[PDB]
Symmetry: C6
Subunit: 220 residues, 6 copies
Amino acid sequence: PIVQNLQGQMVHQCISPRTLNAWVKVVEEKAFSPEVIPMFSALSEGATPQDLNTMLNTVGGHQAAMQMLKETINEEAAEWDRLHPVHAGPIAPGQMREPRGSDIAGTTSTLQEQIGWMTHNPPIPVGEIYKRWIILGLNKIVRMYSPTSILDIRQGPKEPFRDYVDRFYKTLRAEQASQEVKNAATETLLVQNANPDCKTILKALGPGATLEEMMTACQG
Amino acid sequence: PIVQNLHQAISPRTLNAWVKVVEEKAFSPEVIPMFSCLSEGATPQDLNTMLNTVGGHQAAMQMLKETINEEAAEWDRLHPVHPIAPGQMREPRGSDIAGTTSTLQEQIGWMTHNPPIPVGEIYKRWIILGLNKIVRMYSPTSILDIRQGPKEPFRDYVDRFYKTLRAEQASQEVKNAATETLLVQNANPDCKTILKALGPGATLEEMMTACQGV
Amino acid sequence: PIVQNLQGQMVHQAISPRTLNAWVKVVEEKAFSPEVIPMFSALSCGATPQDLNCMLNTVGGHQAAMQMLKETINEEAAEWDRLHPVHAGPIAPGQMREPRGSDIAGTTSTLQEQIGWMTHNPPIPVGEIYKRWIILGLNKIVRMYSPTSILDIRQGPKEPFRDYVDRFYKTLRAEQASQEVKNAATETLLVQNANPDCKTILKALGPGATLEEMMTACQG
Amino acid sequence: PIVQNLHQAISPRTLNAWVKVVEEKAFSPEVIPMFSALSCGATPQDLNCMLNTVGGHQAAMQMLKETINEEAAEWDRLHPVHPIAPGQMREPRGSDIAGTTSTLQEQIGWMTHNPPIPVGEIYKRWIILGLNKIVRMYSPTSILDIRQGPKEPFRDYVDRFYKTLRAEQASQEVKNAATETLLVQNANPDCKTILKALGPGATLEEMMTACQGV
Amino acid sequence: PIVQNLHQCISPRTLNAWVKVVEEKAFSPEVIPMFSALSEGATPQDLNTMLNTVGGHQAAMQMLKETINEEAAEWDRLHPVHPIAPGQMREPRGSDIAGTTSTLQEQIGWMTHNPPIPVGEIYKRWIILGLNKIVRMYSPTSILDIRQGPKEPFRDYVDRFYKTLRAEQASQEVKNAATETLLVQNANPDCKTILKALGPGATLEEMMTACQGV
Amino acid sequence: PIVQNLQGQMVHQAISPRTLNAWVKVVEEKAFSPEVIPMFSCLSEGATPQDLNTMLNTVGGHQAAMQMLKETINEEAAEWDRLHPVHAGPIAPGQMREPRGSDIAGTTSTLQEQIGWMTHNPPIPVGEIYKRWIILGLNKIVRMYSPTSILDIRQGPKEPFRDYVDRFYKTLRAEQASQEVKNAATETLLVQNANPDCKTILKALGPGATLEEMMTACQG
Ligand code: NA
Ligand code: NA
Ligand code: NA
Ligand code: NA
Ligand code: NA
Ligand code: NA
């Protein structure tokens, strides 16, 4: 990665085995649970497209997913080559070339070319652009790998309400709805899908009750 | 974070530490001090990273979102944004402090600017307020229900008592004031008699020494 | 904490998650065994009163004890306010205020005010003063939490003497006697409380025998 | 390694990391990317250290030696050594790149010299070529033999399929081209019918969504 | 410690390391070299920290106190303190080296002063002398009692033999001199005959090769 | 150890508890398996003779071996004193003495004297010289501790060929033959010692077949 710490200077450094090992373990244990993505984002801060490839490529298993993730990266590379066509010309001595889709994705560029683009002024953040493509790819996978439809999350007859809500908002997180639409499934589905005893208690509350108020209500 | 030595990337060890604490301890009161100590010098981005890498307890994390919205709203009411002075940068809105609508660059901007605009420490304050509500919610038993068993060591009973109290968060005036009242009333019969016999102004040392024997 | 390492300069740094995790584990495992206190002292070298509060406040459980520890800190704060009364006056531009009991204890001061006092010349070591109060508090707890009275430590009829001595001096450590009074319980209690066979052997040694000599003697 | 900040000793943590990965994973394809990432800026000495601290898989490590010999021979054929210019150092032979006949001093010499002679990165290339052969060898089942079971989730079947393929190393043209052919032909009957019914231009998403239901 | 790079606080990892070694290994001889290596550049405060964070083995730690007192007494006898030169600091008494009556400031003073007064390394010497006594004490079996079993591999027997010897601390002249004598006399009958048949000037290699077969 | 990292400067540093703990564990677990030696070499890069002694001396157990290793170090010290006789003379102010066998081995020198020799120009690499002696010593032990003779490694009747080869070349590694003589035991012993079914397949290959080709051949 590249972050500014060598005094005032901003020097490149080798991806940390601890960062790698961290990312591989999270993927092994958690299997594209939604929280994996924020973890990916946080382990890959200031990551070069090489670094990103290292993290993705050291995942053994979930290869179905990693293939899907390749397909997505290709789609976002194609769309980039359509939007930014390279005007083929000999490189002026003081400049470097414009990066193609495949160059951002780290497939056709060198670490030198990648450090070039990111540390150039104005910046060409090939790291952060490729990251954007990957994350878009993971989101699709997370939505895919979410086991149950939100419709199917129903509070059991003996199940604590706090447990039911915990599943409900977990499911929702995976089946990625914007936190406007998550806040709007609150006063609708969550109630409709509660068990009979606790549904009655939640209807009796009236509208516009907070999540605190609903969970306090069904505590028994 | 932003650290004064000789910005830095949030440490995988810090993340892993915070995620584990949340996994194991489940909004036990001691979680919050841990949050505060793992998030020293944290940018609002960093804070979001820590909160967002918690899988599970999503009920709670939703509640914590609701609280952050309330503290953002109250900020936009108190500071309504009205043209950028050449040497300065823009004024941060509720959503900008909370890291939702700002960049890491804008956040580093505000904290390292003179005079300082500590968007890190302000958002932290909002989060902690949010966790407190959750901790109070997740506390299993009411202080009223903590009663010393007939064979239960007094030291064990007090340990539950003041744990419960910590969760059902009471001011250190009201914690000090439940001592000479409830703790005694809720002790077992043998040890209650011993604690009444002590008279009023008795320390916790003196009470626990007293009921060591029974 | 603050220790001098940024070249010759002496810079403040964030309390290390590893230091915290270390201290919390020791408290979890060892439960105010005497060795906990030296560990506390060694994990809190150069600690600001904020840092100290962090370490104490991240202990969940032993809350009975942590309440007791609060009571003690209040007693040492009161005694400080009696000894150093603040003369209410507007702060001269080049100075800072005098710290009250509650300011040392980190309850009413900021990290800025704390760094102020410690790095000021002459030094006002609010870190080291609060530490002194805490440790006094833990000592009381350790003495409290010591399970058996030294009187009750008696060598069993089949128990190796080296085992008996190990309990004996452990108990003594908890029931904190000065290492003059620990050295003086040697040639008295330790012998009186040994089993019959080995007591006879230890009396036969005469006075002024070392611990080595006594333990060599009762090897059988 | 040789690292640009503000030579260094190979980190016990790097060594321990690499040895464990080889112990646990046994030339699974993902081992190689891990090798590449643990050996960033590695001197040919460092590389030998990593390979030589692998106990066991000695069959493989012998094979890996044979390959390194082949790439050393091919180098000595392409660059035959013919007197040392006052400002310069000698030209590296096959055996000198491979770290067998050079010193750490000579290796630091070549890499930090201008123009750079990246003996680290050249030897790495030879090793990786060697591991690829071993990975292809150690892959247990032929892609032909990966068939979706009658009760096996399609997501599970695809996961084996593309794992196998990874080992039996195929170009990302030939990986993309086994998709719309073998993967379908080797699916179970119920899900094959569903995948044929999709028509030709179907993504992996679309295929896996399709067979989620069955 | 005091470390020359480009005082520092004793590392929690150093502490944790030392406490674990004492917990697990129980004054096995190898503990002492470990003590010496974890306490490189240690101030007398640091040393006290390491010794004082050992819970348990308190019998031993008391003995170790007695020894430190003996080496402090012997120091006060050899250096009796007799007015502070303007550029200098006071002369350290037995109790000042042992860290009991000095401050960290006074200790950093003595070690970083010119000429150097290595209070760290002097106290260390006293401690190690103390541990040696304990190790010799805690050694379970007398070298006389180490005898090769009738079915026991010779390599196993020698491993006990030289372990025992290490504890019952013998000079490397007396260790080298118990070789061609006791080790043979205490071998089992079959292998003793083989070792006598070797003649006198035989290495440990030669003896262990000889009894590999039986 | 001493490696050049304090900017351009080359400063001595304390042997890392993690390095020690690493080396002790490897010796505990692996018991002079051949791979131990490369590990020793890699944990002891830039090691002073003191450091080396620390690593060797913190091995508890395998004391038989550590005694043998002492005997070897003495033999290489004697041979050094024969080759470099010290001419007894008063030390010229700008110089230091010539190191004796026992001085290299760290037994009779100080850390100061050792840092002296290594950082002197031209260098006197007492670290790297003692290391050479140790490694020679470990090789003898590894060859000793190798359980079976290469002659005795025979492919079982049901044993996968890849398993048999893995033992074969492991054994060989211990019974240290040069990788010319390891490459020459390939087309001879490995075949002669294969099981009947797979021997026939390997003879049928002709001479000069690679290890790949042989292992591909006996895959069934
Ligand atoms: Na709420
Ligand atoms: Na409350
Ligand atoms: Na081969
Ligand atoms: Na292939
Ligand atoms: Na003694
Ligand atoms: Na002895």
